[PDB]
């Protein structure tokens, strides 16, 4: 199922290019590209990606920012596109395909705070998402979250599935072969990883005893819902889709639809390693367990 | 799997009969009947229906109305029944079977506002729902919704699945063959369609640039949950199950359980065509994409 | 898939041992043990259990209680452990394995009110949960629920799945063979049952006409989400995860993630039998229907 023009193609990852161009305007450039990713040990997936990552690179903007987004398509044969769930846009004008070896620029506002999925909008969308063209954009609320002052440390986690390679029958009728977490960096020194079964087990996220941790999370699917849970704690506060108004307290587990996001906050009271799972345990067994290592210093 | 007495049977659809009989009392009559529906192009399903539609015809009542419901059973051999999720009733007295060629009348109050599933209660209920005996009843809140004055246009959407014809093994162990949206008319001129893979793509719902749209939605299943999302917008306000108290804001995607409902509202800011999906993309690929065409005038 | 050391093993159920040892401290002792349970008529599952029940015995504590938990492992060969979702603990110190024929004691606080899953934490956790090592701990809120004074009668229900016996491939890739409810006693005279397809149909929970019923519910999975619904009523009030702050009203159906809990309350207005389902009807057909028998006296 590897089309002829993708055989042997492995386009090196490139950094996200993003810069502020006004008090409420930002530029973002990504590149659709075909990149080999090791999704499980010994298992390479020649992913359809933004910038050579799957999920793609994290985007963070402020509520009220207009995004002037450029997609460069490095794929030699397949068109690609971008749909940000954060934005108000005309899908048939603003989320349209960019042909191989071309670029397109689209402009649209991010009016709403939260933790939004982004993904390719090219038909069949299932094929583009399943092959790796998904990611998260965070829109920071102008008025913050009411618990901001309580948070000591924060990370981003994303859940996705992987199927048999570029197999539309499997994508629409089969169980996922792997379900995985990745983490995308918010600040210098944070890990930045791809959706695989092992990295966040072997290189756990780090925290310090007694801290309140915030996670910005999204389940990008393509197909499954997520029962998000941190072992050994309870979520003090949850904001559904990251909108400050959608405020729950004391949740053991947060139900995320496909493309669903949340801001979750919890306290780690003792040193140790804390697993992070989807509690749909078939998916956890197939890769969807990350680890948080809590030490007396917060360093390894 | 087409029982002998249903071979060749295709009972013409009939309109819903409903009339108000007091300030807080309504009469409703439906007919259980066997009707061929084209669920995908070239694919006829000899559905078990209310009134020859699947999902069945929309019912709208006011909070506090008592419903005097009559079911006429036109099926030559299978008993059928009605369960409205809106009502407080004794299931073993009020949701009981009506035999072939008979009628039954049942009375019960709709005390609670919202967007409720209805379906046959005859065992096996899975068989009756999967074969098409599902629908929505809307109960309008006595005090409205706090965002009523902001809404410019409204429609009803229903999600359902279709399986291999009358195949209980597939119904309980197989993936859906199709997942579909339909729209049921609230006002004269609104579309009224059945659950199929194509009608709401080829004949999109219509709206005008700048409008706030309300959708009354329910995922009737039988089996799947729904990750309901409108491309190119964000839900300004969501009322879970259509109860005004269950008020979320700024949701990208609304998680609906099987039988779950919602009132969702969103703004369309630019001309274009806006897909409406379940973001469980295996289901979207198998039919569950509707379209909203937004024009400068709101007409086609 | 019955390991040699479990052949012929059927360890008799034993009562939960629990006692208060201070105003905010309790002792609890359980025993990991291998016990034959009839999950469907004629179908024995040699379950991995706490105390010979699956789901395990109900635990009820007060918000702010510290639990001094002892696990005795009667399994001749497999290690087992305990993870309470109620507690703040170090998973790698406090949820660790107890070897065959050994005991371990762990201490941790239940700081948060609600209806929490508990289960074994031994890897693979999917295997331990699927084989029966799941249950519920209720933590009573110090300030109650705002609707406490309206409730006439209460019960606990738990949803779980059963798969092919000890079959890891089926656990992670197959549909459940059975999906079931059980009820765990809160007060003397309440039923106390295991997850099976039939007991709560043949011996329904009892209530009286006009009562407001509270159910403490949790869907322990391992793998499925639940669309929890009581036929013939609407939930007056719902508290997600049993936290009083997470308060919804007038819900027809409550979406529970895997491990998700709730307190749900509803009124039964007429005599009759009221089914209780997950509205994912493939699961209901495979066992997940319980009954509530409502009589003029509340007795049978
Ligand atoms: O609570 N994680 O199994
Ligand atoms: O956001 N619809 O893929
Ligand atoms: O509403 N139970 O089918
Ligand atoms: Cu610009
Ligand atoms: Cu793509
Ligand atoms: Cu999307
Ligand atoms: Cu009448
Ligand atoms: Cu029927
Ligand atoms: Cu129902
Ligand atoms: Cu002690
Ligand atoms: Cu165990
Ligand atoms: Cu758990």
Short mmCIF file of C-alpha atoms in Angstrom, two decimals, chain A residues 100-272:
data_model
loop_
_atom_site.label_atom_id
_atom_site.label_comp_id
_atom_site.label_asym_id
_atom_site.label_seq_id
_atom_site.Cartn_x
_atom_site.Cartn_y
_atom_site.Cartn_z
CA UNK A 100 2.35 18.70 -4.71
CA UNK A 101 5.28 21.13 -4.81
CA UNK A 102 2.98 24.12 -4.27
CA UNK A 103 2.14 26.37 -1.32
CA UNK A 104 -1.10 27.96 -0.18
CA UNK A 105 -1.83 30.65 2.39
CA UNK A 106 -5.08 30.94 4.33
CA UNK A 107 -6.19 33.41 7.00
CA UNK A 108 -8.68 32.89 9.80
CA UNK A 109 -9.33 33.91 13.43
CA UNK A 110 -8.95 31.83 16.59
CA UNK A 111 -11.81 33.41 18.58
CA UNK A 112 -12.23 30.67 21.24
CA UNK A 113 -9.91 29.46 24.02
CA UNK A 114 -9.05 25.81 24.27
CA UNK A 115 -7.20 22.69 23.18
CA UNK A 116 -8.14 22.04 19.57
CA UNK A 117 -7.38 19.33 17.07
CA UNK A 118 -5.93 20.21 13.69
CA UNK A 119 -5.69 17.82 10.76
CA UNK A 120 -5.73 17.60 6.99
CA UNK A 121 -9.09 18.25 5.33
CA UNK A 122 -8.33 16.41 2.07
CA UNK A 123 -10.73 13.67 1.08
CA UNK A 124 -10.80 10.94 2.31
CA UNK A 125 -10.11 12.72 5.61
CA UNK A 126 -9.98 9.34 7.38
CA UNK A 127 -7.01 8.40 5.20
CA UNK A 128 -5.09 11.59 5.95
CA UNK A 129 -5.73 11.48 9.69
CA UNK A 130 -4.97 7.77 10.02
CA UNK A 131 -1.71 8.21 8.08
CA UNK A 132 -0.53 10.86 10.58
CA UNK A 133 -1.89 14.30 9.57
CA UNK A 134 -3.21 15.38 12.97
CA UNK A 135 -2.03 17.67 15.74
CA UNK A 136 -3.05 20.19 18.39
CA UNK A 137 -3.40 23.96 18.48
CA UNK A 138 -3.79 25.57 21.90
CA UNK A 139 -5.55 28.93 22.15
CA UNK A 140 -4.73 30.63 25.44
CA UNK A 141 -7.72 32.29 27.17
CA UNK A 142 -7.49 36.06 27.45
CA UNK A 143 -8.71 35.83 31.06
CA UNK A 144 -6.74 32.68 31.97
CA UNK A 145 -8.14 29.77 33.95
CA UNK A 146 -9.33 30.35 37.53
CA UNK A 147 -6.80 27.80 38.82
CA UNK A 148 -3.77 29.23 36.91
CA UNK A 149 -2.04 30.40 40.11
CA UNK A 150 -2.18 26.86 41.57
CA UNK A 151 -0.38 25.11 38.70
CA UNK A 152 3.30 24.29 39.17
CA UNK A 153 4.16 22.52 35.91
CA UNK A 154 2.44 21.77 32.61
CA UNK A 155 2.75 19.50 29.59
CA UNK A 156 0.82 18.61 26.43
CA UNK A 157 -0.29 15.05 25.67
CA UNK A 158 -1.95 13.76 22.52
CA UNK A 159 -3.57 10.37 21.94
CA UNK A 160 -3.78 8.81 18.47
CA UNK A 161 -4.17 5.41 16.82
CA UNK A 162 -2.15 3.65 14.14
CA UNK A 163 -3.57 1.08 11.72
CA UNK A 164 -2.23 -1.19 8.98
CA UNK A 165 -0.23 0.96 6.60
CA UNK A 166 -2.40 3.12 4.32
CA UNK A 167 -5.12 0.44 4.40
CA UNK A 168 -8.54 2.07 3.97
CA UNK A 169 -10.38 -1.16 4.75
CA UNK A 170 -8.55 -1.44 8.07
CA UNK A 171 -8.98 2.27 8.76
CA UNK A 172 -12.75 2.01 8.50
CA UNK A 173 -13.45 -1.57 9.71
CA UNK A 174 -10.51 -2.77 11.83
CA UNK A 175 -9.37 -2.33 15.40
CA UNK A 176 -6.30 -0.09 15.85
CA UNK A 177 -3.00 -1.95 15.85
CA UNK A 178 -1.48 0.63 18.21
CA UNK A 179 -2.88 3.41 20.40
CA UNK A 180 -0.29 5.89 21.60
CA UNK A 181 0.55 9.05 23.49
CA UNK A 182 2.98 11.78 22.48
CA UNK A 183 4.07 14.98 24.19
CA UNK A 184 4.67 18.31 22.48
CA UNK A 185 6.89 20.98 24.00
CA UNK A 186 5.48 24.16 25.51
CA UNK A 187 8.76 25.57 26.88
CA UNK A 188 12.47 24.97 26.25
CA UNK A 189 13.55 21.65 27.69
CA UNK A 190 10.16 19.98 27.44
CA UNK A 191 10.10 16.70 25.54
CA UNK A 192 8.80 16.73 21.99
CA UNK A 193 7.91 13.24 20.78
CA UNK A 194 5.84 11.37 18.19
CA UNK A 195 2.95 8.96 18.69
CA UNK A 196 4.70 5.71 19.61
CA UNK A 197 4.25 2.90 22.12
CA UNK A 198 7.45 3.40 24.13
CA UNK A 199 9.10 6.83 24.38
CA UNK A 200 7.02 8.21 27.26
CA UNK A 201 7.51 4.95 29.16
CA UNK A 202 11.30 4.94 28.76
CA UNK A 203 11.68 8.74 29.11
CA UNK A 204 8.85 9.68 31.48
CA UNK A 205 7.59 13.20 31.89
CA UNK A 206 9.13 14.70 35.04
CA UNK A 207 7.61 16.40 38.06
CA UNK A 208 8.31 17.14 41.70
CA UNK A 209 6.57 15.77 44.82
CA UNK A 210 3.63 17.93 45.85
CA UNK A 211 3.19 19.69 42.51
CA UNK A 212 -0.06 20.46 40.79
CA UNK A 213 0.37 19.41 37.16
CA UNK A 214 -1.67 20.71 34.23
CA UNK A 215 -2.00 18.64 31.07
CA UNK A 216 -3.39 20.07 27.84
CA UNK A 217 -4.78 16.95 26.16
CA UNK A 218 -6.50 16.00 22.96
CA UNK A 219 -7.57 12.65 21.55
CA UNK A 220 -7.11 13.05 17.79
CA UNK A 221 -8.40 9.58 16.95
CA UNK A 222 -9.01 8.99 14.10
CA UNK A 223 -11.66 6.59 15.36
CA UNK A 224 -11.65 5.90 19.09
CA UNK A 225 -12.86 7.83 22.11
CA UNK A 226 -10.54 8.11 25.12
CA UNK A 227 -11.07 7.47 28.85
CA UNK A 228 -8.21 9.60 30.10
CA UNK A 229 -6.88 8.79 33.59
CA UNK A 230 -3.75 9.45 35.68
CA UNK A 231 -3.00 6.60 38.10
CA UNK A 232 -2.53 7.55 41.74
CA UNK A 233 -4.37 10.87 41.61
CA UNK A 234 -7.77 12.43 40.85
CA UNK A 235 -8.26 15.46 38.61
CA UNK A 236 -8.75 18.45 40.89
CA UNK A 237 -10.15 20.50 38.01
CA UNK A 238 -11.06 19.81 34.39
CA UNK A 239 -11.99 22.30 31.67
CA UNK A 240 -13.70 20.55 28.77
CA UNK A 241 -12.14 21.49 25.43
CA UNK A 242 -10.00 23.88 27.45
CA UNK A 243 -12.78 26.44 27.66
CA UNK A 244 -12.63 27.94 31.20
CA UNK A 245 -16.42 27.85 31.52
CA UNK A 246 -16.68 24.06 31.16
CA UNK A 247 -15.40 23.42 34.65
CA UNK A 248 -15.64 20.01 36.39
CA UNK A 249 -13.98 19.01 39.67
CA UNK A 250 -12.74 15.79 41.22
CA UNK A 251 -12.99 13.59 38.11
CA UNK A 252 -11.24 10.22 38.15
CA UNK A 253 -11.38 9.91 34.35
CA UNK A 254 -12.20 12.32 31.51
CA UNK A 255 -14.23 11.09 28.52
CA UNK A 256 -12.81 12.58 25.30
CA UNK A 257 -14.65 12.20 21.98
CA UNK A 258 -12.58 11.77 18.85
CA UNK A 259 -10.99 15.26 18.41
CA UNK A 260 -11.95 16.09 22.01
CA UNK A 261 -9.68 18.18 24.19
CA UNK A 262 -9.39 19.19 27.82
CA UNK A 263 -7.25 20.98 30.34
CA UNK A 264 -6.82 18.66 33.33
CA UNK A 265 -5.08 19.42 36.63
CA UNK A 266 -4.03 17.05 39.38
CA UNK A 267 -1.73 16.85 42.39
CA UNK A 268 1.04 14.26 42.81
CA UNK A 269 1.52 13.76 46.53
CA UNK A 270 4.30 11.12 46.74
CA UNK A 271 7.50 10.20 44.91
CA UNK A 272 7.14 7.48 42.32
#
